[PDB]
């Protein structure tokens, strides 16, 4: 069927695939009277090349179409398919993911629902990733982040999201879940994980997890930064895309004297 | 206990090779680091070239052996780092009085081209039991300069003390610069009585320092305020020179990832 210019092909929600030229793009249909609410984050939020813009909207009769690019891949099959991946190949992919976080942090937007399959490839190359969608993220105003809304994929969400009641640190929450990422691209498993739900909010709750033998020094202590009990421990996603991992692989009560040059690549950090 | 020249060396478990002497005539208790002989001479050459000052540590005697030397220091009564641990934080008059002390120490270290290197708390060293005079207490691994030079690569130090430029760039640094952001971490935990970067885990505690936010409380003045923040600027160049910070007013003026309703639980 036409729109304006583009073919709609079915692909069983209520997204279809859209065909112009003859370039490819997905296209999410809405009734008008809803469509304005969904697309206002994309509005608020300055184009990222980790974060999928709107393309086009067309306006018809009874209903918004919305167009996006397409993708080629989410992250949570990609490693499924591969079991664990190579830490070059982990430090690359999560380095963009983190890029899209920090970016929406910037702009006060608060993800809330991060996980594997919200990241895919934007070309056959799946070089590069991109998160796949704001439709449901929460967008804040100015410097605040509280928010109660307790929604999300079990094996990402927090400990403080379980045993708090009221609000949380949603930026918080979300690197959180950036941390069930990392250990879950480098080890292969989920941190916590269980069949039942219930049973898996147990073991989120008691916060017990073991990093195996295989990962790195700089990449155990950038999981252990991210996976802290309490919220405000956890390192922020600008200060994530700092840490000396990433160019490794490309008061206290001592005040101990170090070799600095060990944790640190000037060179590959730029 | 053993003799040295009417001096009784006496063990110091915490302390590698330095042991309290003691005079047999006077009463009096130094401090006592031994060298052997082929190296003692590098280690002392930072004391020769710098003038004595009331807040730097100077070498009371050394004593030659066959096989070592014996370089004796006045004891200090306490250290900068844990006084800050058992004060939670100084009232300004006080962080004031000490916070000279130590930039004194600094500033005519510097004037004689020796960079520091490493400065931290731990360093600075209370003289007597009053407990108001402090010294550096140590040079043995300062870097002696050559003139008005002092650029660098070593990269070693404590990591709340390190500064952004040490992180980022490859190659020198200014020392000096360098010298004056530790300061400025000085100035900012001794009145807060946290650091102004702090984690457990060191690579992530620069990756803070690497970011650069920190938050001065509302608690400090105005005049301390500006003072920690003309320090801890992120461009080396933009930072005081521990000359005028001696000069600036604060000192007078005091399978399936689907998402579900976790409300649910």
Redesign the interface.
């Known amino acids: 069927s036409r729109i304006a210019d583009y073919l709609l092909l079915p692909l069983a929600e209520h997204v279809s695939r859209a065909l112009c030229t003859g370039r490819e793009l997905r296209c999410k249909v809405f009734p008008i009277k809803h469509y304005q609410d969904k697309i206002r984050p994309y509005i608020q939020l300055p184009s990222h090349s980790n974060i999928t813009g709107i393309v086009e909207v067309i306006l018809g009769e009874t209903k918004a179409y919305v167009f996006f690019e397409k993708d080629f891949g989410d992250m949570?099959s990609y490693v499924?398919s591969r079991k664990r991946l190579r830490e070059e190949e982990a430090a690359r992919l999560f380095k963009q993911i983190v890029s899209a976080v920090a970016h929406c942090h910037q702009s006060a937007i608060v993800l809330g629902?991060l996980?594997?399959?919200k990241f895919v490839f934007s070309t056959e190359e799946r070089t590069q990733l991109r998160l796949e969608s704001l439709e449901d993220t929460h967008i804040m105003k100015g410097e605040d982040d509280a928010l109660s809304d307790?929604?999300?994929?079990?094996?990402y969400?927090s400990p403080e999201?379980?045993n708090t009641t009221g609000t949380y640190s949603g930026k918080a929450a979300d690197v959180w879940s950036l941390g069930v990422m990392l250990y879950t691209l480098l080890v292969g498993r989920y941190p916590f994980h269980d069949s039942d739900?219930?049973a898996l909010?147990s073991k989120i709750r008691r916060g017990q997890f073991c990093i195996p033998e295989h990962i790195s020094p700089?990449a155990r202590?950038?999981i252990?930064?991210l996976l802290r009990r309490e919220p405000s421990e956890r390192?922020?996603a600008?200060?994530?895309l700092?840490?000396?991992?990433f160019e490794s692989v490309l008061?206290?009560?001592h005040?101990?004297?170090?070799?600095?040059?060990a944790?640190?690549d000037?060179?590959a950090?730029n």
């Open positions: 949570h499924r629902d996980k594997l399959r307790k929604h999300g994929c079990p094996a969400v999201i379980l739900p219930s909010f700089k202590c950038l252990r930064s390192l922020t600008p200060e994530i700092l840490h000396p991992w008061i206290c009560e005040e101990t004297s170090i070799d600095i040059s944790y640190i000037p060179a950090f």
